[PDB]
Design a protein around this ligand. Sequence first.
Ligand SMILES: Cc1cn([C@H]2C[C@H](O)[C@@H](COP(=O)(O)OP(=O)(O)OP(=O)(O)O)O2)c(=O)[nH]c1=O
Ligand SMILES: Cc1cn([C@H]2C[C@H](O)[C@@H](COP(=O)(O)OP(=O)(O)OP(=O)(O)O)O2)c(=O)[nH]c1=O
Ligand SMILES: [Mg+2]
Ligand SMILES: [Mg+2]
Ligand SMILES: [Zn+2]
Lengths: 17, 496, 474, 276
Amino acid sequence: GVVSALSLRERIREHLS
Amino acid sequence: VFLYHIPCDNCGSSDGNSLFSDGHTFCYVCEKWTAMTYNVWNFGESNGRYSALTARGISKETCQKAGYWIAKVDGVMYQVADYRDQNGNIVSQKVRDKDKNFKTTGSHKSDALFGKHLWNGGKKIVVTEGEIDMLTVMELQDCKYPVVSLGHGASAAKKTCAANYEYFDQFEQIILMFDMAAQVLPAGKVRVAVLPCKDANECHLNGHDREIMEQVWNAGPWIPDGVVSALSLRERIREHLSVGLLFSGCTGINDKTLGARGGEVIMVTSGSGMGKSTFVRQQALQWGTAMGKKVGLAMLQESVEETAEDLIGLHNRVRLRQSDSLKREIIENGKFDQWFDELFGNDTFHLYDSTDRLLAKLAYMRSGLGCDVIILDHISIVVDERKMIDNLMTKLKGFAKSTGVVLVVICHLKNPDKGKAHEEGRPVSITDLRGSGALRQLSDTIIALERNQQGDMPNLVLVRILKCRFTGDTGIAGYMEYNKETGWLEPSSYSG
Amino acid sequence: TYNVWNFGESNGRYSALTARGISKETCQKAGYWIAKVDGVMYQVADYRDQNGNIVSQKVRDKDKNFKTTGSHKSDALFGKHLWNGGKKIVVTEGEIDMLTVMELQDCKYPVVSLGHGASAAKKTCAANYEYFDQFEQIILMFDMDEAGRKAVEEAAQVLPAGKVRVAVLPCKDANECHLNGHDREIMEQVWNAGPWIPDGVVSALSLRERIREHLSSSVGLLFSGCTGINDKTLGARGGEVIMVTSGSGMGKSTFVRQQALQWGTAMGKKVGLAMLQESVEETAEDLIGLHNRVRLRQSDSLKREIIENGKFDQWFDELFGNDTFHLYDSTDRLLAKLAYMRSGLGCDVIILDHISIVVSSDERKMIDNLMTKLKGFAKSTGVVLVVICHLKNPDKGKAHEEGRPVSITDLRGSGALRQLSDTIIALERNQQGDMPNLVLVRILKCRFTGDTGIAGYMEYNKETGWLEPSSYSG
Amino acid sequence: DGVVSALSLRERIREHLSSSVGLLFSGCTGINDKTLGARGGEVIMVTSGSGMGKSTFVRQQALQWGTAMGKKVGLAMLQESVEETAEDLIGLHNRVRLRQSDSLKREIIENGKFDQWFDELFGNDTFHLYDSETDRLLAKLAYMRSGLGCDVIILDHISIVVSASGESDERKMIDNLMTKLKGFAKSTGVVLVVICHLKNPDKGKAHEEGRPVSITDLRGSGALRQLSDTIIALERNQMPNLVLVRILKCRFTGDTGIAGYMEYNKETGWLEPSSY
RNA sequence: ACCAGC
Ligand SMILES: Cc1cn([C@H]2C[C@H](O)[C@@H](COP(=O)(O)OP(=O)(O)OP(=O)(O)O)O2)c(=O)[nH]c1=O
Ligand SMILES: Cc1cn([C@H]2C[C@H](O)[C@@H](COP(=O)(O)OP(=O)(O)OP(=O)(O)O)O2)c(=O)[nH]c1=O
Ligand SMILES: [Mg+2]
Ligand SMILES: [Mg+2]
Ligand SMILES: [Zn+2]
């Protein structure tokens, strides 16, 4: 359930899309 | 017992054969001796052989005198051990193989031991937790001294050792070799010795078996629990002497707080929406990537991506969530990953995605990932509303104790009744913490934020220290000015 | 298990007892016989009803094991069928004792035996209350063990009063005194025994020496920092629970630690701490820094300095040379650890801290049971017990930390804390007022002297940590 | 059966009023005017706050009942041990502070006057003490009534005989203990004094500050005022020595309310009658 | 049969 900040490379731009 | 000598018949000697009181004779020359499953396995049916163990080292006579025999049934190899009674009959068996298939056949009692069917009188006794170490002590002592072993392990010592009391009462001194704690035995009698290896088998296989036998005859006292005398604090204090983390954003805080320590509870409060998340986010961003410490956040208000966008827009001194064209421009030119890599190359930040399930995740974050500062936000969803919050604060104080972690907790305030509200600039008191009255009893540092959004300066804030155990300096720390264009609030020099 | 074993089908035979000293006549009269089944000779006892109907067997083997033949009744007494009246009975614990008394009296006095032993004697004596009404004197004859004293104490409660008399024996019970030749000393215990006195009540004249012993004992430990406190407290004696309270972070632990240091380095008293707020190393460094009149943890440069020049051992040996201090490492197990700290180590002062985690269902019954257990532990021990507690939230008015005078009914959690604590001391200071280093001591409750109110004033030092007796006038 | 007709009862009613009445109190006159002394088979319940002197008054009444009348008195002090509750009565007889003076202890050891102080009061067998479950205590009291032959039974500090046992619901245990003690006092016909405590008020002042007590301020249950005969409350303020007595319930008489005023002595320990 | 003696 704990996700580190390194794996948010293709998630922030997916949220902004 | 020996009586006298008779002339032998096999060797034909005169004084070679010896007669005993038991009726048997023995010659020293010719070497001739005269005279679940619920099924106990027969010895001759399952091909019982007294083979000596080779890979660890146990003689054949010890396996004969102990009853630890190898079965060759069904083409595989089993090591059956036998548990007996005081009468001299087989009570139960234990089957062990390479996969450790624990197939305990027969009536396995709750007070089953090993090696008690031969020994009733004596002075010393050695109790072990396994069977290989017990046979190893029998190898070192040539199978002549009283040594027993538990038949259920060191996990259920409160049942096996408690049921057998009069058997251990017959001796003078009881020596334990469990782990390198059962108080049901009488006091002033039980000794516990310490070996420099894992068990006796490692000292046997690594030449330290002398350190077995030096600890048997010279074992140490009981020493029940963690009652620590003052003599045993020579090196722990010297290790503890060989640190306050600096509060970024204002220099007036560190002049009277001297930072935070290992096992330090910091509480952050203000009015309804006065910017607790922004201030704690600024402290997290200035502590994570600028000091080399690993920080674990647990922001429960927003999601993971939204606080990631906050952090990215904060560090680049812009306002990301306040313009759509600014979000659109940074992705069309490839500068988005440049903000990503220079901030997340060190991986000091760890976010949390969303009540006892939280404490295991905090333990997995602290022990596993190895962080130093853990931040919790929005306590209202987690928390009758008096017993739960007190139990939660007690569990977090116990988690922060003896770990070395800085625990930051964001809380709220209650609604006032008379006078002016908190949004107009009311000086907050210490007893305004809602939910309970124990939140100011376990917290070690309490910081309150005060600002007036409808007054003269809607971007001037005040920091108020309410509780400090380290120094004892509480009150107004200073003033800071908030930026409506970059988000970074700066230390000001406003005077009253 | 199966049925009542007949002597014909089990080869019954009445013989004597050489190893215990009983002839065959007594076992012939009673009915304790020997069966030859399955090779091993089994001993077996017979039970009868009031009329004489055989109802139960007790089968015992060669290796001290028990075997019941079926439903063992609660009114089963060994020897009840033979006697139906009399003025003086003797109740024995086991079964060989009754045969021994029959041997030494030539079958004259009505002597019976129990059917349960010392484990369930109260039930079988409550279920046999109607049988003991037709008698005139009852002589209890039990073992000279702790279980025997427990049986003769608790089983003599459901018996009629004025007819119960207890005899004593120098052996375990009467049979070894029969074997050791003490046949004359047991008959005087049958004829003239001691009545049902030692239940727990005492006489008004038997205390005359012991009140003298307490008169020759019980000196109060003088407090430090203020001489106005000792003028209305007169120290702390054995069995004294002292409660300390103030607001949140007002100086409870600092004052208690200073009191502990002044009792340690100046009186030689063995002090046991149970500090649960912080661990062992922090309070150890606080004691070391406070003895040297500095603030040890509040100076990183001083901690770096004193470890280089080697003067840390000069401060360690002067404190922990005699090992007068004994610390604790962090619910019912705490009582056992404090019992081992008192009895096994030999301390005189026991200090706890922050009782709210210890009481962390309904908290009121838990804190009442906890205070009852600590009061019972302080009773009959002779130890000073210092307990630190906190306060609750006031409804209206100002806060407790802002210099508000605190009342005795502000102790949180329950009202049972002030009902058992002897001396309650509250601390008052105002951190937001004029002087945040001037404190006030308030005696809220005092069972011994009875003088309550403001004791004195002390001034706190921000540099050395030693608060001093001031001379302020309110 | 228990169907006793009223006609065959003339001799029992004639002998019932022949035996009793008496055992006057001490300290105040209004207590004797409103309660008319303590009688056999009654339940006297003395209430106060915390450390308000609820034990000193009962020990002073016990001294006046054991000295001036010679009645056999059985005490059950669970607040302190028997080494102290028999010590303070000597100082109360000799008008000094025996426990509160280290200098007088060595003086009565050396001069041997402690032997004379023990002989001048304990020459008779009128004091039966006890030191420390709930089932064996009533057996001790039955032994004191039947075997020892006591007249006044004092049960101090009831709050540790209903809380020291492991029970799910305490109130039914309090009810059972209260009705069994009432049945014991009815069957034996003995003077019985039982000391309890009060609870926390919801607002206002404290009971140690001059709060007027209510009858619903009893802590633990509501059977303490429904199965008792006389309820006596003590109140003072901390004039730190002006204590007043309130009769909250009297089943025999009807006059309740304020009985009077007493003053505490700091040199002798007696409770002198005040004037106000 | 072996080991030790004194
Ligand atoms: C009495 C006093 C203490 N102090 C400082 C020194 C103390 O170490 C610090 C408070 O630490 P503590 O003494 O530990 O406070 P506490 O025991 O009353 O309560 P808690 O631990 O639960 O918070 O306050 C002052 O600055 N001025 C003062 O006058
Ligand atoms: C009544 C009274 C007592 N005192 C003193 C005498 C004693 O030292 C102390 C109270 O005496 P105690 O009778 O021992 O107090 P208590 O019985 O009410 O306490 P608890 O409920 O916990 O058992 O206060 C006064 O100073 N002035 C007074 O008016
Ligand atoms: Mg503290
Ligand atoms: Mg009292
Ligand atoms: Zn031969």
